[PDB]
């Protein structure tokens, strides 16, 4: 086939930490880990989120079906964070102590 779209993002993406989520409710965006423990969000501009900690997991889905927004999840070897990027507010910041592999 042919790549229907292409783009170059200046940030190194951590391999197994990538997700696509409609963080605006109806506007899908890309969430991907990076060096220094920061998670970037590509909207269609790149916006950084300071996890300030080495990420080890990352996904995005519907965690409360009452609303139609995707929740950005970020796992760390000692923490786990759900994030409503639209209205920046922690859905839950749990401390696992078992890790997020």
């Amino acid at each position: 086939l042919q790549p229907v779209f292409t783009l170059k993002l200046r940030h190194k993406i951590s391999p197994r930490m990538v997700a696509v989520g409609r963080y605006d409710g109806t506007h899908p965006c890309l969430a991907a880990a990076t060096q220094a423990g920061k998670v970037f969000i590509h909207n269609p501009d790149v916006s950084l989120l300071n996890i300030n900690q080495t990420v080890s997991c990352l996904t995005a889905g519907v965690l409360n079906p009452e609303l139609g927004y995707d929740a950005l999840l970020v796992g760390t070897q000692t923490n786990l964070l759900a994030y409503d990027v639209y209205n920046n507010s922690d859905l839950f910041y749990r401390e696992v102590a078992d890790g997020a592999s």
């Binding site: 300030n52 900690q53 080495t54 760390t76 070897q77 000692t78």
Partner: protein, 99 residues
């Protein structure tokens, strides 16, 4: 008006050297602050991790900052000596103009 201008030029060369030393000290201090914030972030974090020789960069930057601080001190002393000598020279020049 000609052996008087050389003292002025020495004074101004010392002033320019001081401004350069200070604008270099600014960059060294910014580097030190950035590496220090990185290290503080590594400290607050629970999980262990290699320092990645960040401490070595911090030591190098600290040595640079101390060297630049000593250089600025010596330049301040030289500038003060040059200013006193220039004060004497301009005293003499005003005397010779008033005569």
């Amino acid at each position: 008006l000609e052996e008087y201008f050389e003292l002025i030029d020495h004074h101004f060369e010392l002033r320019i050297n001081g401004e350069k030393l200070e604008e270099l000290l600014s960059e060294r201090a910014v580097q030190f602050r950035a590496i220090q914030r990185r290290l503080l972030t590594r400290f607050k974090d629970k999980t262990p991790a290699p320092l990645q020789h960040l401490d070595t960069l911090l030591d190098g930057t600290y040595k640079q900052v101390i060297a630049l601080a000593d250089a600025v001190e010596e330049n301040q002393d030289n500038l003060f000596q040059s200013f006193t000598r220039l004060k004497s020279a301009t005293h003499l020049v005003i005397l010779l103009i008033g005569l």
